[PDB]
Nucleic acid binder design. Structure first.
Length: 184
RNA sequence: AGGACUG
């Protein structure tokens, strides 16, 4: 009992496709977990060579959830790297295409604690680590911490739903990137 | 990390 979400929430980027992968075989594969609305494998215009990547659009985000839960994916004898897609409009933010397991979580003030985060974020995946940042040499809480999962996808899914309310607070949740966000 | 490079 949902409406269609906007496209960005239903779209998958598939990296590391084999050269013999086509739209029909990619579509065949991802149709196991949902109805495909669009499917495209990007080619060199001159050579018509596959660029080794593509995009599938599911009809609901739930189907993306299901397909991601089914990993790993072998399409044409090669394990592919599927990720929630990055909008054309955000493709050039620093660190846009970088896959990480570490979630940033700010906006939490001083009353928020590891158990609030665990309890809240448990429902997205297996957590490895939770660290609430206290001040170096004061122990004063700094308003933020880091959740690290065993997989990148809970992070991506979390950040895609950008609105999260935790311990009463509006939390800022982003990826925790080092200066790996340096690319031109 | 995008099809219309069909601007």
């Amino acid at each position: 009992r949902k409406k269609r979400e906007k496209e960005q929430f239903r779209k998958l980027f598939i990296g590391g496709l084999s050269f013999e992968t086509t739209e029909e075989s990619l579509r065949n594969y991802y149709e196991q977990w949902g109805k495909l609305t669009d499917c495209v494998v990007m080619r060199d215009p001159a050579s018509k060579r596959s660029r080794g990547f593509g995009f599938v659009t599911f009809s609901s985000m739930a189907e993306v959830d299901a397909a991601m839960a089914a990993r790993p994916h072998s399409i044409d004898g090669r394990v592919v790297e599927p990720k929630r897609a990055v909008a054309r409009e955000e493709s050039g933010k620093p660190g846009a295409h970088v896959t990480v397991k570490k979630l940033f979580v700010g906006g939490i003030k001083e009353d928020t604690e590891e158990h609030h985060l665990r309890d809240y974020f448990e429902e997205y995946g297996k957590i490895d680590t939770i660290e609430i940042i206290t001040d170096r040499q004061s122990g004063k809480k700094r308003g933020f911490g880091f959740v690290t999962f065993d997989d990148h996808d809970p992070v991506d899914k979390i950040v895609l739903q950008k609105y999260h309310t935790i311990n009463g607070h509006n939390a800022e949740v982003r990826k925790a990137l080092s200066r790996q966000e340096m690319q031109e």
